[PDB]
Design a protein around this ligand. Structure first.
Ligand code: CU
Ligand code: CU
Ligand code: CU
Ligand code: CU
Length: 496
């Protein structure tokens, strides 16, 4: 795969991943966006060259590298109007950052409006030559990356505000109810071998219930965090989450269905929709005729644990931290709210505001949406589910961090001893009180929001301004970053 040094040229073109042709966003002239890889310790140098001409899908762009801490490089995180101004068409921008202490499965996507839905999204893998799980599998390569994506026949700004997907794409391919003879993705394995499959949700909205006929899945990673191995027969993956699982190809040589059931839209597999094919070497090139058996051992988040059984930060009791925050969701006026405020992008990016002198949350715009966080501190955030926030379950994501999930959705228990750690978590349904903990070791403004992009567009977000007084000194910015704002602000509205 390309990387860790590469050019990413963004353009517009026609695509047909489900047999229906529509204009979309291409990356290096292809759809879906290409896999980028590197190795632990790498410095990534990704030059984003924006050549887009379609205003409906936005000519400007900004890319987030999902899951990377970006310590010292807050300016390269990606969220438009939080960490940068967008890159303007006809221009390029170098994202230069290092990943010294992480490895695993990640992804990249536009972080400007709902643009990633239009096609700017792909997988990233950072390999570990000393992976603690390397003995569990024989094959881990470009062909073991599996992506899941929602696809729409109308563009993000053309269809409804919260549209319903027309197809599920697996590795960029799938059928729609309108298409049924479209090509399906094929994942090939050789009997007797063990594979590390890296499952990445590039979803704008739906969650997927994933399973493979006749095979169990041994989960070993969640959102770039190494787990104790946990075997399941199905798993639910929310928007932006990642899981690595080992598959032992020990069944009979044949074709097996790979299934990804969405929580909305077409909720079945008729005609081969929401599916792909697991093909053993030797099997005829036909569709599977296997059947799905009931899942009796589904993945349960509260049962996952980190490889080392790391405790949650803080003391083992509710509120046992330095700063506890509660996020109260709401919806009014067609906009989502958190503690009464709806996020709207400011004219001046939050980072630039800080660099320009703002020293407190009350000095930062947008008002009421920014939270100051103390340095070197244990933080707890509770995100209680409520019907007052339609479209639940909302998968919340915190930038610049991994966090411990001390209470998961569908569970009433709290685990401070060995909870899973991850970066995207479902907040569940009314009755739930998903709670997370993390330590503030990364100065800068970090986005915290629902990863259903249509909800983020409707304001479902806040900014965590971590250790404000140290932001400038910790994150020196390149001249090219400083140039983004004047360039963007000079554009005609038609060229945004
Ligand atoms: Cu993301
Ligand atoms: Cu992120
Ligand atoms: Cu949401
Ligand atoms: Cu984000």
């Amino acid at each position: 795969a390309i990387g860790p040094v590469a050019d990413l040229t963004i353009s517009n073109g026609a695509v047909s991943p489900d047999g229906f042709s529509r204009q979309a966003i291409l990356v290096n002239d292809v759809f879906p966006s290409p896999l980028i890889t590197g190795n632990k310790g790498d410095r990534f140098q990704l030059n984003v060259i924006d050549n887009m001409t379609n205003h409906t899908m936005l000519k400007s762009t900004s890319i987030h590298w999902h899951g990377f801490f970006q310590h010292g490089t807050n300016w390269a995180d990606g969220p438009a109007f939080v960490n940068q101004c967008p890159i303007s068409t006809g221009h390029a921008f170098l994202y230069d950052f290092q990943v010294p202490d992480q490895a695993g499965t990640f992804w990249y996507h536009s972080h400007l409006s709902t643009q990633y839905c239009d096609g700017l999204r792909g997988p990233i893998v950072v390999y570990d030559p000393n992976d603690p799980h390397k003995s569990l599998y024989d094959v881990d390569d470009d062909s073991t990356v599996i992506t899941l994506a929602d696809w729409y026949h109308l563009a993000a700004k053309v269809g409804a505000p919260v549209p319903t997907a027309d197809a599920t794409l697996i590795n960029g391919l799938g059928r729609s109810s309108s298409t049924l003879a479209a090509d399906l993705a094929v994942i090939t394995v050789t009997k007797g071998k063990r594979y590390r499959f890296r499952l990445v949700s590039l979803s704008c909205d739906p969650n997927y219930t994933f399973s493979i006929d006749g095979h169990s899945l041994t989960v070993i990673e969640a959102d770039s965090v190494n787990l104790k191995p946990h075997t399941v027969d199905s798993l639910q993956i929310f928007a932006a989450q990642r899981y690595s699982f080992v598959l032992n190809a020990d069944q009979d040589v044949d074709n097996y269905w790979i299934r990804a059931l969405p929580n909305s839209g077409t909720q079945n597999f008729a005609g081969g929709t929401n599916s792909a094919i697991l093909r053993y070497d030797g099997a005829a090139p036909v569709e599977p005729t296997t059947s799905q058996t009931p899942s009796t051992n589904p993945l349960v988040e509260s049962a996952l644990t980190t490889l080392e059984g790391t405790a949650a930060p803080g003391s083992p009791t509710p509120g046992g931290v330095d700063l506890a925050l509660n996020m109260a969701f709401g919806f009014a006026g067609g906009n989502f709210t958190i503690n009464g405020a709806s996020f709207t992008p400011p004219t001046v990016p939050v980072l630039l505001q800080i660099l320009s002198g703002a020293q407190s949350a009350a000095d930062l715009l947008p008002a009421g949406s920014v939270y100051s966080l103390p340095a070197n501190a244990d933080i707890e955030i509770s995100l209680p589910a409520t019907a007052a926030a339609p479209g639940f379950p909302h998968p919340f994501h915190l930038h610049g961090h991994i966090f411990a999930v001390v209470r998961s959705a569908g569970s009433s228990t709290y685990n401070y001893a060995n909870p899973v750690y991850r970066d995207v978590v479902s907040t569940g349904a009314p009755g739930d009180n998903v709670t997370i903990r993390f330590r503030t070791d990364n100065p800068g403004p970090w986005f915290l929001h629902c990863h259903i992009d249509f909800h983020l567009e409707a304001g479902f977000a806040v900014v965590m301004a971590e250790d404000i007084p140290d932001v400038a000194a910790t994150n020196p910015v390149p001249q090219a970053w400083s140039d983004l704002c004047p360039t963007y602000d000079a554009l005609s509205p038609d060229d945004q």
